[PDB]
Design a protein around this nucleic acid. Structure first.
Ligand SMILES: [Mg+2]
Ligand SMILES: [Mg+2]
Ligand SMILES: [Mg+2]
Ligand SMILES: [Mg+2]
Ligand SMILES: [Mg+2]
Ligand SMILES: [Mg+2]
Ligand SMILES: [Mg+2]
Ligand SMILES: [Mg+2]
Ligand SMILES: [Mg+2]
Ligand SMILES: [Mg+2]
Ligand SMILES: [Mg+2]
Ligand SMILES: [Mg+2]
Ligand SMILES: [Mg+2]
Ligand SMILES: [Mg+2]
Ligand SMILES: [Mg+2]
Ligand SMILES: [Mg+2]
Ligand SMILES: [Mg+2]
Ligand SMILES: [Mg+2]
Ligand SMILES: [Mg+2]
Ligand SMILES: [Mg+2]
Ligand SMILES: [Mg+2]
Ligand SMILES: [Mg+2]
Ligand SMILES: [Mg+2]
Ligand SMILES: [Mg+2]
Ligand SMILES: [Mg+2]
Ligand SMILES: [Mg+2]
Ligand SMILES: [Mg+2]
Ligand SMILES: [Mg+2]
Ligand SMILES: [Mg+2]
Ligand SMILES: [Mg+2]
Ligand SMILES: [Mg+2]
Ligand SMILES: [Mg+2]
Ligand SMILES: [Mg+2]
Ligand SMILES: [Mg+2]
Ligand SMILES: [Mg+2]
Ligand SMILES: [Mg+2]
Ligand SMILES: [Mg+2]
Ligand SMILES: [Mg+2]
Ligand SMILES: [Mg+2]
Ligand SMILES: [Mg+2]
Ligand SMILES: [Mg+2]
Ligand SMILES: [Mg+2]
Ligand SMILES: [Mg+2]
Ligand SMILES: [Mg+2]
Ligand SMILES: [Mg+2]
Ligand SMILES: [Mg+2]
Ligand SMILES: [Mg+2]
Ligand SMILES: [Mg+2]
Ligand SMILES: [Mg+2]
Ligand SMILES: [Mg+2]
Ligand SMILES: [Mg+2]
Ligand SMILES: [Mg+2]
Ligand SMILES: [Mg+2]
Ligand SMILES: [Mg+2]
Ligand SMILES: [Mg+2]
Ligand SMILES: [Mg+2]
Ligand SMILES: [Mg+2]
Ligand SMILES: [Mg+2]
Ligand SMILES: [Mg+2]
Ligand SMILES: [Mg+2]
Ligand SMILES: [Mg+2]
Ligand SMILES: [Mg+2]
Ligand SMILES: [Mg+2]
Ligand SMILES: [Zn+2]
Ligand SMILES: [Zn+2]
Lengths: 24, 48, 91, 112, 76, 252
RNA sequence: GUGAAGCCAGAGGAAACUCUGGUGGAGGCUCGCAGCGGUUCUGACGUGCAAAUCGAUCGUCAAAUCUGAGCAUGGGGGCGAA
RNA sequence: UGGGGAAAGGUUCCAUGUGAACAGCGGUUGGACAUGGGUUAGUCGAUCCUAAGCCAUAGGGAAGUUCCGUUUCAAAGGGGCACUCGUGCCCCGUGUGGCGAAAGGGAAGCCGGUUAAUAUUCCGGCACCUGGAUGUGGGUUUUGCGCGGCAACGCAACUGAACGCGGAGACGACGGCGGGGGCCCCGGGCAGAGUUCUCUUUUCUUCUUAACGGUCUAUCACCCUGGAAACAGUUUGUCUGGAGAUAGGGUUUAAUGGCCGGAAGAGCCCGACACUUCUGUCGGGUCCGGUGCGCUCUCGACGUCCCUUGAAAAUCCGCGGGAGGGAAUAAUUCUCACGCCAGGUCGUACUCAUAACCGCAGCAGGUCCCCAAGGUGAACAGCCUCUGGUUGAUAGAACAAUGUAG
């Protein structure tokens, strides 16, 4: 799969992780 | 047209059982040569 | 039912280019359109693709040969010379 | 027997201006512009078309799920499967020939 | 447009946040009744051959969304 | 007068070479450590035909001794090579058809092809359909080898030059007549702009030295001196002799 | 319109090989529409429709055939089947 | 001499009005004159990529305007992470610019209606693509990254970094043969129309189904059992078979095929009532078969010709490999279903020619393409007709010579 497809998926995971740390 | 008519008839005879494969194969090459003028001439040759 | 007495394959040229010139080209055309037995699979299906390329229609092997023949007398004579020279001298 | 016309500015028949005739629910004869036909992918070694994979233009393959684009085995795409069996057999026998060659050379010629 | 095969999941479709509206069309000549619902992306259609079950279906679906009758010769 | 035809060909505007359909040039591998001391082998993938040439080309795939990849090459194919064949290159390579090994590791009397004038220039001599060169003798001290070229001349090359065993494929291409004006056009239409060609005697005096006249004739000796100004060399240049070749040719 | 290689069947012969009927669809082959070209009437017009056109009659027509846009060669230079 | 376009023209397009001038006669008419009006796009093009080719950079020539040079004797690049905060770290490295196609390569829109003048854009209905954010359902896991089939392979999902291999984009001319859509042709039925001194169960017209999806199927090829000479299968055209045929049973590439949605609510054809107009309302019908060396477009399997073998790049996917990461009460980097947001810039009127372009002009000249009905006939020949389009080229009277054409 092309690189932009992989960058979007890993960027999503990073955003989800920061929100959890901010909440907890 | 004539080649298709003769070849179609021979397939019908073999499946039903009127002739076996050894006579079928010989008649096939006889039809490729200009031997049988029409459908009636071919069935008459089969009877003999 | 032979359709020709002597002209043969080079009958497509009609009455042009002179009798002698048609004979030389016929000598070379006959041998390039024929079929040769494969040296690998053994079937009788090898035909020329390019000016010096021959390939088998069954086993898909491709070999480089002569212009209008699978092999040339000069090239054939060299394999025997090379084989004979190599094996006695080094063995 | 009504005649038709193009619907775009290109007036030439240039292998990218492809049309087919349809009849519309309004009882008229029109022209509908269509794309080109996809080609089935071929095998890596032999060069024949692989079975079980559809034929589309190169861009549409990005919208289809993975299981529809492959076959569940080693070298799922790009290899027919007859060639895959040849690889398995050829690889196994070659290594076995290597074992006997080294034992024969190491033992029978380095015993001194 | 997409078929809904049976009754059970059609009411499931109508119980969605984006089910804007719905309508009923009946064809007297062929003795057929069609139920259509309009969602965000598709327009699901349910086909009923009988007429008795049509009455039960009309009242089972949620009362929030509207139901129409699709008269003849809709005005432009 | 004006500029004659054979003076214009040097400007390179219309008389250039057509190179759209040619993929790569034909060369050996660069001289490297592996091929100077041992040998490496590669697979023959395809036998292809490129326009404007006889002698069908061959594509060979080698590995890389320093990096995780493989390199494809392009050779001139000797008669008898086949797809899937293993061919070897190096100093210790075996002596079979298709191998590439330095000219020193070769007995006298063998025919080779694509011989390097100097070690490392990747092929200069004997690379046309059905041609080859022959080794004659060695000089183990001050290493140098005598060879015989297709024209008959003899040459001495350094002993480290390379060559590929066998005869260039393509055989006797030039035996059957072209027989048709169109066939000649197709042959040249993929090489250069040199067909057809006009006789100089039918031109006008402003165009060519052979010029005009009330009869078509040259008017003066057709053998031109070796040192003449450009625009004068139209004819037999620096001819040693002339006429039908009856006897044998002393030069060798 | 003509009907080259390859293929099928029958007949003759000691053999080498030769006859007859079909099949097939090769060629800078051929008659002939559109296109392209421009032989004759030394026709029409010749202060013309036109600073090269019009009519009848003609040459070639599956190949060295006809053609659009993009790019290159510039004056003692270019290009030229001359 | 019909219906639409490329180059070129630039308001010639539509409405209302008009004395002169122009339309080689007239003129109430006009492509003329005067005053107003008209060209709506995430889906059609440009924009993106490269071809022949052109021009910067490193360097060398020339008194100089400038000439050569395009990877060349160059220290020439880009990727990831974390910090309160930009300014701090860590890998890889052979290579490293732009311009150049409205006919090449290429993500995505179809039907109905509407204006004096535009619409694949505006209105109504039903869809799709790319990019960016996020939640529910279902899936997987305590044997940590799914099951089934001998097999070809199947299904709604079903981890995969560096580096590497392969496929698609991606390609000639001609010849006969077979399948599909459209058109033409023949028979029956329901409506309306023409003809009728006599004949004709007669002659003519209407009877339509889009994009986008679901489901069942269609040549080549491939897999399993088995083992062929009294050789067999088989094309219009002799190719195929112990390197595994015939035969029996299976898997799969390819709808412009059948049925259902969309969709009869639409469009079209008749009949019966309403009336200054703003205005209409309500009834019925919208079927069933046959034929072929027919015409046109498209797809597939074979074959012929070459000292001729018939472009490149952007872009997209699969595989080899195993870096990293992750649950037992939830976690989850699940390419599955549904849902949330956004898509900028310029062109779009009209002619394309015996009057809108070039020939001094409203000139018998010249200028690249798409669609293609009936009869006679070998036929895109010539001659007659239907749909659609014109009836425009200064006119009236007489019929000597000499002319041009027949
Ligand atoms: Mg990658
Ligand atoms: Mg794996
Ligand atoms: Mg050289
Ligand atoms: Mg020339
Ligand atoms: Mg000459
Ligand atoms: Mg002269
Ligand atoms: Mg002179
Ligand atoms: Mg002189
Ligand atoms: Mg003479
Ligand atoms: Mg001819
Ligand atoms: Mg003309
Ligand atoms: Mg005259
Ligand atoms: Mg006069
Ligand atoms: Mg004339
Ligand atoms: Mg006459
Ligand atoms: Mg004539
Ligand atoms: Mg051209
Ligand atoms: Mg000057
Ligand atoms: Mg001069
Ligand atoms: Mg001068
Ligand atoms: Mg010329
Ligand atoms: Mg018009
Ligand atoms: Mg008016
Ligand atoms: Mg006037
Ligand atoms: Mg007047
Ligand atoms: Mg007036
Ligand atoms: Mg007007
Ligand atoms: Mg005006
Ligand atoms: Mg939107
Ligand atoms: Mg587009
Ligand atoms: Mg843009
Ligand atoms: Mg770029
Ligand atoms: Mg420059
Ligand atoms: Mg400088
Ligand atoms: Mg550009
Ligand atoms: Mg294009
Ligand atoms: Mg819209
Ligand atoms: Mg709309
Ligand atoms: Mg999306
Ligand atoms: Mg869950
Ligand atoms: Mg993988
Ligand atoms: Mg192309
Ligand atoms: Mg058809
Ligand atoms: Mg007909
Ligand atoms: Mg009827
Ligand atoms: Mg339908
Ligand atoms: Mg249909
Ligand atoms: Mg079978
Ligand atoms: Mg329906
Ligand atoms: Mg209706
Ligand atoms: Mg009605
Ligand atoms: Mg007819
Ligand atoms: Mg056509
Ligand atoms: Mg328009
Ligand atoms: Mg036109
Ligand atoms: Mg004109
Ligand atoms: Mg006709
Ligand atoms: Mg007829
Ligand atoms: Mg006609
Ligand atoms: Mg008109
Ligand atoms: Mg008069
Ligand atoms: Mg008179
Ligand atoms: Mg007269
Ligand atoms: Zn073979
Ligand atoms: Zn394979």
């Amino acid at each position: 799969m092309r690189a932009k497809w992989r960058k979007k998926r890993t960027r999503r995971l990073k955003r989800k992780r920061r929100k959890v740390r901010a909440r907890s | 047209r004539r080649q298709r008519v003769l070849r179609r008839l021979l397939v019908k005879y073999r499946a039903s059982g009127k002739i076996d494969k050894h006579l079928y194969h010989e008649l096939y090459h006889l039809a490729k040569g200009n031997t049988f003028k029409h459908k009636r001439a071919l069935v008459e040759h089969i009877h003999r | 039912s032979k359709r020709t007495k002597k002209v043969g394959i080079s009958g497509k040229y009609g009455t042009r280019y002179g009798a002698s010139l048609r004979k030389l080209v016929k000598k070379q055309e006959v041998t390039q359109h024929a079929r040769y037995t494969c040296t690998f699979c053994g079937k009788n299906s090898v035909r020329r693709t390019a000016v010096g390329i021959w390939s088998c229609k069954s086993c898909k092997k491709t070999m480089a040969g002569g212009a209008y023949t699978v092999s040339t007398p000069a090239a054939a004579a060299m394999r025997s010379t090379l084989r004979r020279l190599r094996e006695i001298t080094e063995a | 027997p009504t005649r038709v016309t193009y619907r775009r500015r290109n007036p030439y028949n240039t292998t990218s201006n492809r049309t087919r005739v349809i009849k519309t629910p309004g009882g008229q004869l029109r022209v509908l512009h269509i794309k080109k036909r996809g080609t089935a992918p071929k095998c890596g070694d032999c060069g024949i078309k692989l079975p079980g994979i559809p034929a589309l233009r190169p861009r549409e393959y990005a919208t289809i799920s993975k299981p529809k684009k492959t076959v569940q085995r080693a070298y799922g795409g790009s290899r027919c499967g007859n060639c895959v069996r040849d690889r398995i057999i050829r690889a196994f026998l070659i290594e076995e020939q290597k074992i006997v060659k080294k034992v024969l050379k190491e033992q029978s010629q380095a015993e001194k | 447009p997409q078929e809904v095969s049976d009754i059970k999941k059609f009411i499931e479709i109508c119980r969605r946040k984006d089910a804007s509206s719905a309508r009923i069309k009946k064809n007297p000549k062929t003795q057929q009744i069609k139920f259509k619902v309009r969602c965000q992306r598709f327009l699901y259609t349910l086909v009923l051959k009988d007429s008795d079950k049509a009455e039960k279906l009309k009242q089972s679906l949620p009362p929030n969304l509207q139901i129409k009758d699709v008269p003849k010769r809709n005005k432009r | 007068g004006r500029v004659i035809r054979n003076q214009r060909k040097g400007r390179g505007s219309v008389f250039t070479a057509h190179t759209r359909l040619r993929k790569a040039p034909a060369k050996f591998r660069p001289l490297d450590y592996a091929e100077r001391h041992g040998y490496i082998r590669g697979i023959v993938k395809e036998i292809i035909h490129d326009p404007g040439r006889g002698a069908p080309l061959a594509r060979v795939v080698f590995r890389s001794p320093y990096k995780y990849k493989q390199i494809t090459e392009t050779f001139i194919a000797n008669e008898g090579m086949y797809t899937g064949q293993f061919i070897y290159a190096g100093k210790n390579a075996a002596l079979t058809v298709g191998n590439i090994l330095p000219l020193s590791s070769v007995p006298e009397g063998t025919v080779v092809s694509n011989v390097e004038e100097k070690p490392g220039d990747r092929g200069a001599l004997g690379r046309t359909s059905g041609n080859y060169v022959t080794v004659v003798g060695h000089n183990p001290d001050e290493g140098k080898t005598r060879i015989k070229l297709p024209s008959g001349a003899k040459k001495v090359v350094p002993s480290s030059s390379r060559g590929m065993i066998g005869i260039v494929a393509g055989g006797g291409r030039t035996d059957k007549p072209l027989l048709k004006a169109s066939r000649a056009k197709h042959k040249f239409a993929v090489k250069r702009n040199r067909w057809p060609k006009t006789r100089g005697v039918a031109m006008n005096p402003v165009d060519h030295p052979h010029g005009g006249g009330n009869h078509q004739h040259i008017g003066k000796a057709s053998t031109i001196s070796r040192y003449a100004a450009q625009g004068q060399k139209a004819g037999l240049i620096a001819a040693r002799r002339t006429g039908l070749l009856r006897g044998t040719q002393k030069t060798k």
